[PDB]
Amino acid sequence: EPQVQFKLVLVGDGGTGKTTFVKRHLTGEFEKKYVPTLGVEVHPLVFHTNRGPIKFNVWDTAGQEKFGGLRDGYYIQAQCAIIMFDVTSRVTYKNVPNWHRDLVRVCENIPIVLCGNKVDIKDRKVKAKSIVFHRKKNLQYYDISAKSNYNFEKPFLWLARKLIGDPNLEFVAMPALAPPEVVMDPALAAQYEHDLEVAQTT
Amino acid sequence: AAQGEPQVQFKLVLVGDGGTGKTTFVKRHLTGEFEKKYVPTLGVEVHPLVFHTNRGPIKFNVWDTAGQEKFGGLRDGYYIQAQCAIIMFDVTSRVTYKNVPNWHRDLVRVCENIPIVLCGNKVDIKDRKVKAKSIVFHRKKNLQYYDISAKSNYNFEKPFLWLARKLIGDPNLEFVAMPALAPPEVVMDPALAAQYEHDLEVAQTTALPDEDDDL
């Protein structure tokens, strides 16, 4: 018996929280592999479902998105992807169409999740209403906070259900995660769950 | 004290045009059909549908008509004190889907804002007429849509699980075992159903806003 494993490419502008988000899964950070010529650290994030164990091999840049775009060798053969932006910085959100264009060019029809990071910060600029355009392009969306572990499992559980072809798949146990570095205010979480229902109802 | 401690129970009214499959749908729960009670003043059968959740047992008292919706509207006593509802139509007959707004408006006049599920029945029939493209304009205030097939038991538990989450105020509530159901009288194609479920989700997002200024 082999191992069920998928290549996942994590992309988005420099400074949005890609490396802080991938590093919450403790054992994946411990067993990571650095490949200098591709400009990547591949993290093996194992998750335990009701039908057995699965492995997401998450590709995280080495910081070469700050002064340029990514090569075709980073994208080739990916089976799924995450695009990230910061919700306190509008320029990171406006570059989302161009990250999506690269994924489509090299990989065609793969399941992709869009993530808005840094929702623990009070003065938010990009809100639920501005994500409607991306949902019409077939991206799935979640509000995330990498520092407090808010909604960490959501992107990986939606991607596992799509790939396997089972809408009733569940995780039976959570992976060991880095302890929260900030508190996710509970009044802000309830308001943002309300914003998303109002924007996407009907 | 199990008998002293009451029962959690809700009145559910089941409404929609004559011939849409309401009686057939409510009869799939076998113990509900065996224990039903007749009310002669209003002409209704009340079926006690028991479901077992992760926090314990609950009971939906379903009020099914005796066919007086075929000749006209229903009296005020049928609707009074309902806590939730189901509105049904037939996907091979377009006049039943066009009367959906009139059934909704009767509900809100007597009962105001109770939680409602809209069901499109008879998705086992090959030549389907009302599809997902036409259905995604009706889901608005306090309402949810599910495709359904009463003869094959397709999606039977979905309307009842969405309503229990809304009535109790618990979005993580689950059913821990299924009720005994009448054995299927026709097969629902598994590849057809998944296609139909994906069609509703993509029709959802194509109807949506994209108009600046929304609060």
Ligand SMILES: Nc1nc2c(ncn2[C@@H]2O[C@H](COP(=O)(O)OP(=O)(O)O)[C@@H](O)[C@H]2O)c(=O)[nH]1
């Ligand atoms: N408060 C807060 N700061 C965050 C969060 N995610 C990232 N940051 C900050 O954003 C900066 C860049 O993070 P980094 O992981 O290097 O992002 P990357 O360049 O996309 O890989 C750092 O100062 C982080 O501490 C978040 O969830 N909350």
Ligand SMILES: Nc1nc2c(ncn2[C@@H]2O[C@H](COP(=O)(O)OP(=O)(O)O)[C@@H](O)[C@H]2O)c(=O)[nH]1
């Ligand atoms: N094939 C099929 N026929 C159905 C289904 N539901 C209802 N019918 C048929 O539709 C007709 C009306 O059913 P009935 O339960 O009397 O509906 P009511 O008047 O709304 O209470 C009958 O001939 C049923 O057998 C279904 O899921 N599949």
Ligand SMILES: [Mg+2]
């Ligand atoms: Mg980085």
Ligand SMILES: [Mg+2]
């Ligand atoms: Mg009937």
